Design a protein around this ligand. Sequence first.
Ligand SMILES: C[C@H](OCCN1CCCCC1)c1cnn(-c2cc(C(=O)O)ccn2)c1-c1cccc(-c2ccccc2)c1
Ligand SMILES: [Mn+2]
Length: 306
Amino acid sequence: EFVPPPECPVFEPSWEEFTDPLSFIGRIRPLAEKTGICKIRPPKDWQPPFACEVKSFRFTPRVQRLNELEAMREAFGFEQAVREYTLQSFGEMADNFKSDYFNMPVHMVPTELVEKEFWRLVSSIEEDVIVEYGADISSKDFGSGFPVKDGRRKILPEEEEYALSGWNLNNMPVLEQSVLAHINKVPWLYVGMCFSSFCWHIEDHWSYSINYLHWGEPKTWYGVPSHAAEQLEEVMRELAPELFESQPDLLHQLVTIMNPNVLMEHGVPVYRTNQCAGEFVVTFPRAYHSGFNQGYNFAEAVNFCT
Ligand SMILES: C[C@H](OCCN1CCCCC1)c1cnn(-c2cc(C(=O)O)ccn2)c1-c1cccc(-c2ccccc2)c1
Ligand SMILES: [Mn+2]
C-alpha cells in the first residue's frame, strides 16, 4: 500500500514575524527550499472573512477521471463533461460523493485513508472513479476569497486589515523584473471535492506560488525540492507513455500523474502535508508539486516574485 512521504516543514510565525510575507519567506528559505514546499500557520487571531459573492457564484467544474493514464471503449470522449453548479450545490454533491464512497460521515474519514484510496484508484484498471474540480476560476469573476478595497463589495471596519494585509494574496508582488517591462496577474480559485487533484508541475518562469485554503476539508500536498527537479523529470521521461514522452513540458504537465512512492523509489526526495483551512502553502522556485483534495474545500492561489 501507499507509504506516506515525510512531512514538509510547518511554520507558526509570531505576530512580529508575520508582519511581512516576503521577509518571512526569505528567512525560512534555507530550510524550505530544501523541501520544495512548506506550510505556514498564521497567528490564531488572524482570521480573514470569506468575501466571495456566494449568491451569484456559479461555475462549471472540470471532469477528472482518476485512472485515465493507466487506461491506455465504445464512444470514447463522451463519458462525462460539463454541468453548472453553485457553491452550495457543488458542496452538496461533494459531501454526498465522499460519504457514499466511504460509507461514513465526511469528517470521520481519516486523511491517510483518502490518501491511500486516491493512489489506489489512480492505478486501478478495474474501478473507474470520476470526480469534478472547480478550478482555475479567475478571481476577477466572482471576486477574491479575501476582501479587496476595489469598491465592488462592502468591507466592515474589522475586515479592513485583511484587505490591506501583505498575506492577502491580492497584495502579493507579481510583476517580474525585465527590460521588456520597461519598453512595454490575479489569484485563481479552486473549489475541490474528494479525490479532485492537480498533477506534478512547476510554475511558469519557475515562479514562487502561495496558496491559501479559505475553508473546507484539507488539501493534501506533495512537493519536491528544486535541486531534485531534473531527477524528477528523468523519472517522468523513463516511465511516461511513449506518446507523451517527447511532448513539451508545458503540455506534458497536463498529464504528469505519478505516485510519489515511485519517485521515492528512484531516489527523488518527496515531502507531504495536509493543508487545513486557514493555512498557507508556499512552493519555491522550480519545486515540483502535486496533490489532491480530501473533500469539499475552497482554495486561492497566485504566483509571486521576490
Ligand atoms: C499549471 C497550472 O496552471 C493553471 C493556470 N491556468 C490559468 C488559465 C490558463 C491555463 C493555466 C497550475 C498552476 N498552479 N496549479 C496548482 C493548483 C493547485 C490546486 O488545485 O489546489 C495547487 C497547486 N498548484 C496548477 C495546476 C496544476 C495541475 C493541475 C491543475 C488542474 C487540473 C485540472 C483541473 C483543475 C486544475 C492545476
Ligand atoms: Mn502550482
